[PDB]
Structures are given as structure tokens and as C-alpha cells.
Amino acid sequence: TSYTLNEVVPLKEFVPEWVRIGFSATTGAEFAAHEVLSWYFHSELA
Amino acid sequence: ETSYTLNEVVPLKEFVPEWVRIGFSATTGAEFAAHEVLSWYFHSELAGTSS
Amino acid sequence: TETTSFSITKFGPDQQNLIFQGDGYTTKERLTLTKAVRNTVGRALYSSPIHIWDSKTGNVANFVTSFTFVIDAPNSYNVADGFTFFIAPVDTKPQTGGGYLGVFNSKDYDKTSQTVAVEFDTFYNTAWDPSNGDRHIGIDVNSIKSINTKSWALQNGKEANVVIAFNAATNVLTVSLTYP
Amino acid sequence: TETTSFSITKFGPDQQNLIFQGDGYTTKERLTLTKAVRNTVGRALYSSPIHIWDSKTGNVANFVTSFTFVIDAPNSYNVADGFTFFIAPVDTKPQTGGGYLGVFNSKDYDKTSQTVAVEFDTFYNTAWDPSNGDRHIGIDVNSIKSINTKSWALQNGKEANVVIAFNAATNVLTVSLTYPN
Ligand SMILES: CC(=O)N[C@@H]1[C@@H](O)[C@H](O[C@@H]2O[C@H](CO)[C@@H](O)[C@H](O[C@H]3O[C@H](CO)[C@@H](O)[C@H](O)[C@@H]3O)[C@@H]2O)[C@@H](CO)O[C@H]1O
Ligand SMILES: CC(=O)N[C@@H]1[C@@H](O)[C@H](O[C@@H]2O[C@H](CO)[C@@H](O)[C@H](O[C@H]3O[C@H](CO)[C@@H](O)[C@H](O)[C@@H]3O)[C@@H]2O)[C@@H](CO)O[C@H]1O
Ligand SMILES: [Ca+2]
Numbered sequence: 166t167s168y169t170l171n172e173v174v175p176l177k178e179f180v181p182e183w184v185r186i187g188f189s190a191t192t193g194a195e196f197a198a199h200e201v202l203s204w205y206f207h208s209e210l211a
Numbered sequence: 212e213t214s215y216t217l218n219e220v221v222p223l224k225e226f227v228p229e230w231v232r233i234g235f236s237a238t239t240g241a242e243f244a245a246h247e248v249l250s251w252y253f254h255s256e257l258a259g260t261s262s
Numbered sequence: 263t264e265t266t267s268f269s270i271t272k273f274g275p276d277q278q279n280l281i282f283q284g285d286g287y288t289t290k291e292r293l294t295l296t297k298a299v300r301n302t303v304g305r306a307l308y309s310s311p312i313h314i315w316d317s318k319t320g321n322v323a324n325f326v327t328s329f330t331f332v333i334d335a336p337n338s339y340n341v342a343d344g345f346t347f348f349i350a351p352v353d354t355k356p357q358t359g360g361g362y363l364g365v366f367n368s369k370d371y372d373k374t375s376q377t378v379a380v381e382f383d384t385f386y387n388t389a390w391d392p393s394n395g396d397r398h399i400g401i402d403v404n405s406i407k408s409i410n411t412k413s414w415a416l417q418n419g420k421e422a423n424v425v426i427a428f429n430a431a432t433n434v435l436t437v438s439l440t441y442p
Numbered sequence: 443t444e445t446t447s448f449s450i451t452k453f454g455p456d457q458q459n460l461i462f463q464g465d466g467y468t469t470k471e472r473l474t475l476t477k478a479v480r481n482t483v484g485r486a487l488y489s490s491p492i493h494i495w496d497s498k499t500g501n502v503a504n505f506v507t508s509f510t511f512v513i514d515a516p517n518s519y520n521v522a523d524g525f526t527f528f529i530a531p532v533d534t535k536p537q538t539g540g541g542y543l544g545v546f547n548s549k550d551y552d553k554t555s556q557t558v559a560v561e562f563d564t565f566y567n568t569a570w571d572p573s574n575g576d577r578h579i580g581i582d583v584n585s586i587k588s589i590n591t592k593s594w595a596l597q598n599g600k601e602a603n604v605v606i607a608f609n610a611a612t613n614v615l616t617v618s619l620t621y622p623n
């Protein structure tokens with residue numbers, strides 16, 4: 166089953182030049198366990 | 212093109228920790244010189260393992 | 263040219279190249295952000311800063327990340343709050359929990375946040391989420407109120423494969439979620 | 443499987459993915475470790491820890507690094523001390539300067555050191571360096587006395603390209619320095 170979402174997001178306008186990337190998950194009154202099983206990342210700045 | 216080469220068997224797991232930092236060092240003493248690095252590429256690949 | 267890459271196929275007990283915040287920790291080869299407990303926050307960041315754009319040149323990076331995650335709820339109705347992949351300042355720390363997913367603090371646009379996030383939101387919060395009440399994938403920039411959302415059906419306990427990619431030439435951010 | 447990779451083709455003024463120690467800094471697209479000044483040390487580390495082997499499986503990583511460096515001395519005769527690519531504990535800090543290259547403290551094996559380094563040594567230190575007095579490439583493990591060395595002719599001010607590779611299946615560490623003419 167696949168779900169796909171696309172959007173023009175001009176990153177330069179919102180984020181500092183140097184960034185940290187990661188994951189976040191929370192619970193409140195209701196809850197679930199949130200887990201990540203593997204991670205791949207690659208970036209290329211010219 | 213003039214090349215220089217050296218190969219040695221060094222069993223790294225007998226010497227370094229499992230997690231490491233890599234880098235460059237340069238010194239001068241009584242005599243000196245500028246030491247610069249113009250570009251740097253690195254790639255490591257550990258089969259399977261964090262454990 | 264500047265390039266950063268890494269891959270972690272299975273997380274070991276001492277993943278030193280990651281920064282953990284909140285209750286984030288690693289167990290049984292998985293990164294666990296949250297336990298099925300209420301009112302918690304967990305986050306994990308890659309250790310290196312990454313260079314995403316440059317003011318001298320005006321250039322911005324192309325990038326791609328892929329991960330597979332699992333959401334495991336007590337049942338398919340009582341599920342909250344969701345999960346996020348985000349890009350934030352180097353000194354980023356947990357923001358508000360619950361519906362704010364650990365990364366934002368308001369439904370109003372806040373330029374100070376400097377955080378873009380792709381969210382997998384499992385709880386309907388009436389003040390900002392889609393009024394259809396559905397579970398959804400959304401894109402957030404500096405606000406918990408998404409710029410755009412796609413309805414998604416959670417599959418409790420199943421591994422989901424996500425690919426997020428950004429094309430600097432068109433400034434298009436694409437996210438693809440697949441239950442294989 | 444774990445991989446870490448990066449490339450820096452031109453260093454910028456604020457290279458936040460590097461940790462600088464001593465005098466190291468970046469100027470005009472170069473990472474400068476020392477200026478041509480006496481008695482200093484400059485070190486630069488990649489900011490991420492790298493997983494180089496695993497105690498659970500006993501597996502060791504394969505890795506490759508290439509870089510171009512320049513040594514620029516006041517003349518071809520009064521040059522010291524040299525340069526190093528090293529692999530050390532995550533909390534590595536500068537050790538002795540001078541002939542020790544900011545990475546070791548002794549001529550004797552020091553098990554607490556836990557660092558292995560490939561040196562490009564430009565000054566003959568009578569206590570430990572190969573007696574022929576030549577400048578050389580050396581592989582060092584826990585000691586400034588290289589376990590193996592190759593004589594190298596310094597071309598002052600020229601770019602040198604090196605490739606360092608470790609093959610986990612054989613435990614062979616290979617070092618290649620080429621001067622492009
Ligand atoms: C129709 C109905 O009553 N449905 C209930 C919800 O009312 C309830 O939602 C919670 O309501 C509380 C106030 O009554 C809030 O304090 C809760 O907010 C916290 O939890 C949510 C979900 O985890 C977070 O998004 C928030 O950020 C807060 O942390 C919440 O709105 C839920 C919980 O029992 O059940 C419905 O059936
Ligand atoms: C045979 C002869 O006379 N050779 C001389 C060397 O003696 C001289 O080398 C220096 O000698 C000093 C005292 O004799 C030492 O203090 C110097 O050591 C310091 O500098 C070197 C080089 O930078 C470092 O490796 C050391 O760690 C110290 O920092 C050095 O050995 C040289 C020129 O100085 O001329 C020779 O011909
Ligand atoms: Ca919500």
C-alpha cells in the first residue's frame with residue numbers, strides 16, 4: 166500500500182545553513198510505541 | 212606521476228576502541244612549515260555490526 | 263562540494279553516532295523513540311551537523327533519507343501522537359510533547375522555530391489537524407499546522423518504508439510511505 | 443551494516459562538521475593545521491564517531507580515505523615536523539608536539555594510547571626515526587617509532603594526493619602518496 170505527498174518547500178528561507186537532522190515521536194493521553202528499524206541518509210551540496 | 216607506497220598487516224581490533232574519531236594532526240618544533248589539506252573524502256563499512 | 267552519508271541497518275546498544283533526547287534509546291537492534299506509555303517524548307539526531315545550504319553561493323543541497331519504522335499501539339483506536347523526521351538548528355532540543363510531536367510549540371507560524379518536519383500523525387487534534395479526523399502524513403514548516411497532508415491508514419504493528427527526498431533544482435520535497 | 447561517509451572538496455570558513463584542536467582552522471578553502479611558525483600543533487577531527495569494529499561479532503570495518511595536502515616550508519632543507527592521518531578514541535586530545543606529531547607521547551609502546559596513525563614525517567629525530575635520515579611515510583601503532591617506513595622525497599609547496607585503505611579480510615593497511623608529475 167503506498168501514500169505519496171509532494172510540496173515545493175524552499176528550504177533556504179526556513180532553516181539555518183548548518184542543521185541537525187533526526188526523528189521525534191511523542192505520546193500524550195493516548196500512546197503507542199514508536200520505533201525505527203534502519204536509517205539511510207545522503208546529502209550533496211555543490 | 213611519481214608514487215610512494217607502504218602496506219602493512221595491522222589488526223586494528225587489537226589496538227583501537229570500537230568507536231573512534233578520525234582526523235589529522237600536524238606539528239612544528241624548532242624547524243617549521245605550513246601543513247594544509249585541500250580536500251578530504253572518507254568511507255567506512257562495518258558488515259552488520261552494532262552489538 | 264560537500265557530502266555527508268551514513269546508513270544504520272540495525273541499531274546496537276551503544277550507537278555513539280547518534281544524540282538521544284527525552285527517552286530515546288536503542289534496544290534489541292531498534293531505535294525506540296517512545297515506549298507505549300503516556301506523556302513521553304523521545305528524539306534521536308545524527309551526530310554530525312550537515313551543510314544544507316550556503317549563503318556565499320546561494321546553493322542548497324540535494325538529499326535523500328529512507329527508514330523503516332513501526333508504530334505499535336494497544337489497539338487500532340487508542341493511538342497517539344505520531345512520529346516525525348525533521349531538520350532543525352544544530353542546537354535543537356525537545357519542544358512541546360503530545361500533539362506538538364516534540365518539535366513545535368504552536369499552530370501559528372513561528373519564524374524562530376527554523377524547523378521543517380515530515381510528520382506521521384496518528385491523533386486528531388481539533389485545533390489544527392484535518393477536520394476529516396483521519397490519520398495523516400503531513401509537511402510542517404515552523405508550525406504544527408501542516409502546509410499539506412495526505413490521509414493515511416495506520417497498520418498497527420506493521421513495518422512502514424519511507425523515502426523522503428529533496429531536489430534543490432525545483433525545491434520539491436517528496437515523501438513516500440509504503441506498507442510492503 | 444554501518445557505513446559513515448563524507449567528502450569536503452573545499453573547506454569553508456565555518457566547517458561545523460569538524461572539531462578543531464590546537465591551531466587548526468580553515469582559511470581560503472584550505473584546512474590549515476599549522477602556519478610556518480615554530481613549536482605549534484593543529485589537529486582537526488571529523489565530528490561523528492565512526493564504528494570501526496564490533497565486539498559482538500568480532501567484525502572489522504573496511505575503509506578508505508583520500509586527501510590532497512601541501513607542505514610549504516621556508517626552503518627544502520629546514521622542514522619539520524610533519525603530518526598525520528590518525529584513528530583514535532572518541533575523546534582524543536593533542537599529545538606531545540614536535541617530533542611526536544601531536545598524537546603520541548613516547549617511543550615505547552603505550553597501550554593506553556589506542557591510536558594508529560600514518561605519518562608523513564619531514565624531520566629526522568635521531569631517537570626513533572629510520573637511521574638513513576630520509577623523510578618518510580610511516581605506519582605507527584601506539585608509539586612514534588613507526589612499525590614500517592618508506593623513504594619519500596618532499597616536493598616543497600606541491601600538492602600530494604594520498605589514498606589510505608584498510609581491508610578487513612586481510613588486515614592490510616595500504617598507503618599511497620603520488621606527486622602528479
Ligand atoms: C470525544 C472525546 O472525549 N474523545 C476523547 C478525547 O477527549 C481525549 O483527548 C484528550 O483530551 C484531554 C482533555 O480532555 C487532553 O488533555 C488530551 O490532550 C493530550 O493528549 C493528546 C493525545 O495524546 C495530545 O495530542 C495532546 O497534546 C495532549 O498531550 C487529549 O486531547 C482522548 C484521550 O483520552 O480520548 C478521546 O476518545
Ligand atoms: C647533527 C646536528 O647538529 N644536527 C642539528 C640538530 O641538532 C638540529 O635539530 C634540533 O636540535 C635541537 C637541539 O639540538 C632540538 O631541540 C630540536 O628539537 C626540536 O625541534 C625538532 C624539529 O622541529 C622537533 O622534532 C623536536 O621535537 C623539538 O621540537 C631539533 O632536534 C637541527 C635544526 O634545528 O639542525 C641539525 O643539523
Ligand atoms: Ca495530532
Ligand SMILES: [Ca+2]
Nearest residue numbers: 541563565567
Ligand atoms: Ca620525525
Ligand SMILES: [Mn+2]
Nearest residue numbers: 383391400408
Ligand atoms: Mn497533523
Ligand SMILES: [Mn+2]
Nearest residue numbers: 563571580588
Ligand atoms: Mn617517523
